[model samples]
Target chain A: MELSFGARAELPRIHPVASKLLRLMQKKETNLCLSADVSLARELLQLADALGPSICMLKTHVDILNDFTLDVMKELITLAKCHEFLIFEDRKFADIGNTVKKQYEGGIFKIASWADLVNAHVVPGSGVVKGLQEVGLPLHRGCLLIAEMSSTGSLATGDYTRAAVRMAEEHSEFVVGFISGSRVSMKPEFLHLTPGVQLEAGGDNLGQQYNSPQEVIGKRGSDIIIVGRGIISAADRLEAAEMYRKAAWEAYLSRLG
Target chain B: MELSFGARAELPRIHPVASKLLRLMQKKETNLCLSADVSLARELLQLADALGPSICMLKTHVDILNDFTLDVMKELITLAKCHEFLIFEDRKFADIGNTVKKQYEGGIFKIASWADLVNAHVVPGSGVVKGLQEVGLPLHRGCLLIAEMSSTGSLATGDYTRAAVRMAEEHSEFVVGFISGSRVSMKPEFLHLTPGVQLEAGGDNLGQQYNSPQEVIGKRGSDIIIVGRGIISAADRLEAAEMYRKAAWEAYLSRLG
Candidate 1:
């Protein structure tokens, strides 16, 4: 049942939060990261409570909830602790060191206090990553760099993705991996958190495109699969999650084989 | 009283928000953006209410305030309307299309509802600008692309800044301008919102460097100069703002001459 990479890797040396997420991914035998894009705090919390156990990470945009509160965050933290999953706040912060420091630490969302991992843009260059680390390092938080996106018209490709990977490798202490599609020659210690995972084969009317779990995990060699509407918008979200969970796990195992 | 670039350009055809910012920059004869990075909601509101008339844009990190609320936003909007200023939400978003849309419109912050202009990182490529446009276009909102940073150890350099400019120009509708350093060869249609303007010549222990209003506007050809702690942390905040405002406007006029 042990995953080859998870078993063989030296966990202690990785960023604390990354180590926790990787360990949990192996322990839970799932690499599913649920993008909870709901608009209500209650619905978000309910989804977190319902789908927490099936996924290793619950990615969130905390700003969207209509009734976002500290209480909801407290409850979400409780759910993460109870389910043994980590909370990934999809902030994708791209400000300078000082402003970003304020956004991370002082904001009402207090992202540094809740999120185990966050998303940041390396576009502002290494300083953005450094700014995030100044706040996150003390709190043992890790960041996922947006190397590439799953949208149809995205500019994050070729040299951009390579540069993103380079930044992640250069700042491996704070940047654990990337939100990218397909695998590239990168440090094995770094994880590839690929989004746009769905059971169906097509994309929406909007520019967003989705690939099957096999396409990402088996063919692309992405370390984890991030599923949004494919799981959350299902008739039975838990059942849908479990189905994808099994499929994703099997796909990973087959990739190993 | 006539400004060179902003006047000759087809302001009516550009995004409504950008048109307003440029028009005001000309009418008021000021290109001062105050970074209202405060911790308390009351203090943020106080600064906005006091300095609203002196600056064309009231830049805010809404998340940083401990007591941020819709009521505060209502008051800020009221102040903006009365003072004829614009709200620039400093949510330097850098994510995929779906997630970034949620961050802009859906969050407790509901940045799209109020912010006339927002900041984004071109790191994720054109999709990020596209995502912001989807939500912002209907609202007549504009985005300030992070083409460069004023930080000491920033990664946004030559090729990266050039790439950022290309993205902004390619998607000129939504991306009105850049949060840049010295002027580059960008199109005249786009504005340059430069940060790091301060009365002092030295930088903080943190990597933030400072240049005078004259340096950014007179020497660098920056359309606007953004000042943060220089004004927000002053003993007489309003007075400090007035001083920077006069210095910036004079510099812009001097540049014109």
Candidate 2:
């Protein structure tokens, strides 16, 4: 009953509900893959709208914003809506099932009510897959299995990363995708979203390391090459955005070719 | 220097900051084990306080509450403070590190500002643990290393669960604890908060299974046995709390003896 054209197109050959969700996720793909300075809310909105054509979703470190509130929400949503983008709260909720359920059901974010998609740490059990569904949220649940991460500081081994991929497959229907920096060997079915897609050699001003979406695309054949500062921190932010987006689409298409 | 503690009373040999936290965790032992009632906030808090002596944390499903806002925070915090408990926000934050960082630092919940601890999903990479710690809140990073859950519909397998446990151990000093129902071969050095601790052989109205805190103490040797509706739904709520507290004391003393 509750379906839309975008949702249908997004999910082509799945159950109605699953398909609707998959469609929504594809819509999310158009809306979510975003970047912004977020340091200045209005300025960020302007930037978001400018780069909106290239992004499907916008990832934000919104907490760093000195003035992110309801007012900001209104402007951000307005701009995002105009540009046809979705917002991923991106707060990787990872606790016990009971607590994770509470996070979904309760709290300030009350994420299930609003988030087009949410992220989770699939550690408690696959029972969480049910919990996400019960919250009346479509299961565009991006799970961080923490495989060979982007960091050189990681303690994860190959066997450990492989095992995580295996777990991810068990709930692939519910999972939106995965995030990792390592050369993750995912089942062809699972879409790999590689973050830390750095452009510069120096990486983040803080501690975050980045890889080039262009080069990593060449190496990993990643479905989504996520670059935070590589685009946002670039001198010409919009140019940088187009560069990565074109590279991502090119790489994805080439892989199929 | 990172040091580990034990169930035995060895006077917490660690940093002054960490020792203060560990002692607080001990002092607020009753609050650590929550009696979650997924129905209403008012009733949940009442039962939470009644059972506060036997629990140190109150796990909540805030989405069900018709009235949720920043206004309730003062009252919630008042209840927790009066009961000497800490708000263990079970929001499993599993986004990219920056987004996860923002969710903790400030946002709707201003989680780092309000909560004492949170749940995080740890991968072999991601720096999620470090991101959460940067906000100064302790993290009970989810390590889905336990394969079999107390629930019948559990989805995660055993092999990956073991690997998750391995990663959890390395971050034990920085992380709050671990959550699992699967039987592990190794004895965990930190807090092992197990869900599905009930007194009845059959599950509750909501299908949540549990064991008596006494059974958890004597048999499972659980650091915290979480019970949802065990006390709140009881006719004599206070008596139910007393029994749990007595069992916890007995469990602790038996280990000492």
Candidate 3:
């Protein structure tokens, strides 16, 4: 699987989508990503408007919104254009080629119509990735395979995570990198999106542990630090977002140093 | 795994959900599951209204309908009550426990509120299953783990499929069976649902292979045969569904013999 994993500068040139996101991060001067996992469209859009200026990407669980409509997406697209950030949908699609294709295109959440980046599981094998690629290729949309998760009791480890990385490398055009815990030994070009970033110490009752932005970016070499409640649920979300933004960006620069 | 892969009768008693479905199948005298993968809610409900009487379950890609709403679900529930069938939502959720829990419970779809059975990928390991289980347990909703997808170049085979089966067995209460290609060496109590069934002998352009009811039921010992376009796209869907029902029922009875 061509496993000579190296640093971003030392590795071969990255794909256009990955390069585009990296350039955007550099241009925006922040590597922090806000995971807008709110349950209502209004709240999500409000957060988008408030935090769009400080973050490089806005991650969404589109299905969680109570009023997910085309209008919401239209507004989100407009906000994205105005803020010059990307829209990442955490639609971890893992189905057969045909079903996954239907889910991607025909669904109420016409994800193929908008999302700049999406993530999926490589569990259904290469066909799952292939199906997503077929729909994504036309739009120049990119994917991030879930190589490892940042939750407790997750089974994505060792062989499974390695296989996920191999699959992402094989389908490099469609797959950019991975939504992993630590930076995987992949081509430096592949972006590593690590979640579970919190200013607080412990996790919820559901076994979701928290890591600092420094742990993910500086220590683990992650390209992006996805902070959910840490930013969204704070008393002053804009200030909290700004706090994460500086912490994550500073850690990223230190890592580069 | 307690690997006694015996016939349904020889196996240990199945889970309540599986038992409920089996009883319904036996009483209704049909094992044919029609995949309602249409794009509009009206068309999907129309098909459900017509074919609900002949099929044991009406499987849906809930997100595909352009006009999916509470009213649509309400009508569907009414039709299901009149026909005594089940609603299987093909929501192949593959995410962390906390996220998936929200997806199942708080989404616009509100899958945990209605669907009798839902399916998801075992990619994130036990956490994915655990998340669905946490939300589904209270509602008596069951899950069908995707062990092996029926498509070309699928990676859900060998070790991956085996691991999926193991995970399903470990959480037998919330996980009723598997959406598998072949009869896995699982506890007989765990149901085996095979998709890609068709009366025709060929496959679609998207790498989905089709197997006859006899091939899946008589040959592979699959408990349920999930037929999608084979029935939904026919000139007369009712007639096509009837043909599949007779063929599947006959094949299932012969297999029992």
Native contacts kept, each candidate: 0.60, 0.26, 0.63
Candidate ranking under DockQ, highest first, comes to: 3, 1, 2
Q: Candidate 1 vs candidate 2: which has greater TM-score?
A: 1
lDDT of 2 by residue, A111-192 (tens): 5544555555444445554455556345443433444556534434555556556656665555645666534653444445
lDDT string for model 1 (A139-232, tens) is 9888988888887756677776777888788888888888888875446667788888898888765467899988898888888888889987
Per-residue lDDT of A74 in model 1: 91
For each candidate, what's the DockQ? 0.52, 0.22, 0.55
lDDT of 2 by residue, B4-103 (tens): 2233223342323223334555665541367465555666566656666556666654434545555565677778777766566555454445555676
Docking outcome class, model 2: incorrect
Sorted on lDDT, best first, the list reads 3, 1, 2
TM-scores for every predicted model:
0.90, 0.73, 0.90
Q: Can you tell me which runs of candidate 3 are displaced by over 4 Å? A: A1-14, A199-201, B1-16
The local distance difference test score of each candidate is: 0.81, 0.54, 0.82
Give residue B239's error in model 1 in angstroms.
3.4
The true-versus-predicted C-alpha distance at residue A137 of model 3, in Å, is 2.5
Q: What docking grade does candidate 1 earn? A: medium
Candidate 1 chain A lDDT trough over 10 residues, lowest sum = A1-10
Candidate 1 residue pairs that clash: A63-B107, A63-B108, A64-B106, A64-B107, A107-B63, A107-B64
Compared with the real two-chain complex, what DockQ does model 1 have?
0.52
TM-score of model number 3, chain B: 0.93
